[PDB]
């Protein structure tokens, strides 16, 4: 319930932008907690940070609604 639209920080935007007409980069080091996904963020490759490790994951177009917090499982049950 975030009735006034999505929420993505502006200190997430500042790594690269010129990968819009070219083949994208591989390094996206971040914190990857607060920001959700809205369709301008499709098909990148982000090192999602889980408190210890910026774990790399790339994007499908239907991995689209939830935040960057599904893909930082901080439990380590193995």
Partner 1 sequence: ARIAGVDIPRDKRVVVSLTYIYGIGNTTAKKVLANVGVSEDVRVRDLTNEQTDAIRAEIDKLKVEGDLRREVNLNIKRLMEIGSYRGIRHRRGLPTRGQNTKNNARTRKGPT
Partner 2 sequence: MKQDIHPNYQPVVFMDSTTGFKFLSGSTKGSSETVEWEDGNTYPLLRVEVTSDSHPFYTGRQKFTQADGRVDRFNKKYGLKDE
Partner RNA sequence: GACCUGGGCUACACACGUGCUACAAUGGGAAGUACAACGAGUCGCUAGACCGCGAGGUCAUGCAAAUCUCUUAAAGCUUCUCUCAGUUCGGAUUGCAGGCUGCAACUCGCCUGCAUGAAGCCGGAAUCGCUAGUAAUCGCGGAUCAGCACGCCGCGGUGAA
Q: Which residues bind RNA (CB under 7 A)?
A: 1-3, 7, 31, 33-34, 49-52, 66-67, 69-70, 72, 74-75, 77
Smallest separation, CB 32 to partner 2 (Å)? 19
Are the C-beta atoms of 63 and 39 separated by less than 8 Å? no
CA distance 50 to 69: 8
Cβ closest to RNA, residue 24 vs residue 33:
33
What is the contact mask toward partner 1 in residues 15 to 54, using x (rule: CB under 8 A)?
----------------------------------------
Are the C-beta atoms of 55 and 48 separated by less than 8 Å? yes
Q: Residues 6 or more apart from 60 whose CB is under 8 A from it?
A: 42, 43
């Amino acid at each position: 319930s975030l009735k006034k639209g999505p929420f993505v920080d502006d200190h997430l935007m500042k790594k690269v932008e010129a990968q819009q007409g070219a083949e994208k980069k591989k390094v996206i080091k971040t914190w990857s907690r607060r920001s959700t996904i809205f369709p301008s963020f499709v098909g990148f490759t982000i090192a999602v940070y889980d408190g210890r490790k910026h774990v790399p994951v790339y994007i499908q177009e239907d991995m689209v609604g939830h935040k960057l917090g599904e893909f930082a499982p901080t439990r380590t049950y193995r």
